[PDB]
Structure 1
């Protein structure tokens, strides 16, 4: 029996829902309380009766604040995760620094009074938009114990991710002109190791900013990826393997079965 399974068996409706089965609360980490990042908001399930949850840190991109990624916080946490949306030390920080800050935010959770007993500190994951997605890849490259990484329209000068050992879902936007998929997202996917459990999902017709307001395709597959790899939850593989038949997806690759 998988001890990390949380919540009832999933369906298309359950993974598409704006709020999953877990009621959520939130707490604020001030810039002064944040060591190594710019503060953030932690969203967590209030129901502790099924045990501890994996933890996820999410970074915004260049010039952006938590508000550009905030919707992901409670939408993911309500599926059974402790999720921190961060602000960066400055909004001009580059991807490598964003990766250091994502790790600092995860480590903050280990001692945070509100959530220390709610997380399984051994099961953590990273996500981010654009430079924040470059930061998520950097954080995985620097920490092979992370269970999942999800760069959303990621931007980074670093194109070679052969060092990553963390299952990674790369989400590109077809019409992205800021972090074009050919030179960013797809290049990242192609340099991740052949053997790694990974996937590439390109969002049809989407601009670079698709992640900055609610997008059901982004949410449902991020949830499935986090469930499958943070929780080792085999109930969620069905949404990723084989490729889903989804008009919202213009290209797809995945190393199924995982």
Structure 2
């Protein structure tokens, strides 16, 4: 049962470190692509399986290197992950959405044969930090064929996204760049009632929590991607009946349980 199932039965511990798949990397040069600034693809190797794909945007003034740990973490659990660079480090959230859109098309159509061999392009998702997280919300509204969206400490001036794509938002309690009261929480609350949604708030965390190895971000991001991109109900346990001392808030409409 479940053709998209990959990897062993998960434990919490295992989701806080790199997973069972060997990871290859491919550098997408800036000038090689139109529509975004290149980036790095992290993808499984030493395996004959295909996997869902994820495009991920860094935040305002940041490089793809700021999410390298997470691109590799996700790939090692069984995903093809393209972390983009943006045309300009100064690009806003809606520009980042357009670039995510270009990056997804690139992954499907134009990426190296070794990457395409590992990709099931029928199953794609998005994630992003800060302004990249605002871009993640925007693209989830523009393209409801996506399987999931994970905005990390998101920032956007638009607060309402009418998307049917399942969304998990990570807020940071002590974020002064994108305060959760103005950004993450409004975004959560304003998503449709009928859309599966989760909000987790990291205790004592700042806006840069996403930029280094973070156990909570790892567990929640892997679990949401597995649940929605792979239909992998083994990951429900991490997202349901949650009692996590790393969290200082948790909200859900419990559609995923």
Normalised-by-shorter TM-score class:
over 0.9
Q: Contact 2:197/2:255 (CA < 8 Å) preserved in 1? A: no
Secondary structure in structure 1 of the residue aligned to 2:122: strand
Q: Determine if the alignment matches structure 1 residue 196 to structure 2 residue 195.
A: yes
Q: 4+ residue stretches of structure 1 with deviation over 4 A?
A: none
Superposed CA deviations along residues 132-163 of structure 1, whole A, max 9, x for unmatched, are 000111111110000010100000011011x2
State the match for 1:224 in structure 2.
223
Distance 1:168 1:34 in 2: 28
> Aligned to 1:71, what secondary structure does the other structure show?
helix
Q: Could you list the per-position Cα deviations for residues 208-239 of structure 1 after superposition, in whole angstroms to 9, with x for gaps in the alignment?
A: 11111111111111000000011010000011
Correspondence for 2:214: 215
What runs of 5+ residues in structure 2 fail to find an aligned partner? Answer: none
Looking at structure 1, the residues matched to 204 and 71 of structure 2 have their Cα atoms a distance apart, in angstroms, of 25
Once the two structures are superposed, the pairs formed by residues 30-179 of structure 1 within 5 Å of their partners are 30-49=29-48, 51-111=49-109, 112-113=111-112, 114-161=114-161, 163-179=162-178
Determine the C-alpha separation between the residues in 1 that align with 2:43 and 2:22.
8
- The answer on 1:235 being equivalent to 2:234 is yes
Number of residue-to-residue matches in the alignment = 254
1:115 CA drift (Å):
1.2
Cα contact 1:35–1:108 (8 A) shared by 2: no
Map 1:178-189; keep pairs closer than 5 Å: 178-189=177-188
* Conserved 8 A contact 1:56-1:82: yes
- Aligned match of 1:28: 27
Cross-structure match for 2:13: 13
RMSD: 0.9
Mean Cα deviation higher: 33-42 or 111-120 = 111-120
Whole-angstrom distance in 2 between the partners of 1:198 and 1:257: 8
State the distance in 1 between where 2:32 and 2:47 align: 25
Q: Deviations over 1:30-69 (max 9, x none)?
A: 01112210000001000333x2100011111111111111
* Structure 1 unpaired stretches of 5+: none
Cα offset, 1:12, TM superposition? 1.1
* Whole-angstrom distance in 1 between the partners of 2:198 and 2:223: 12
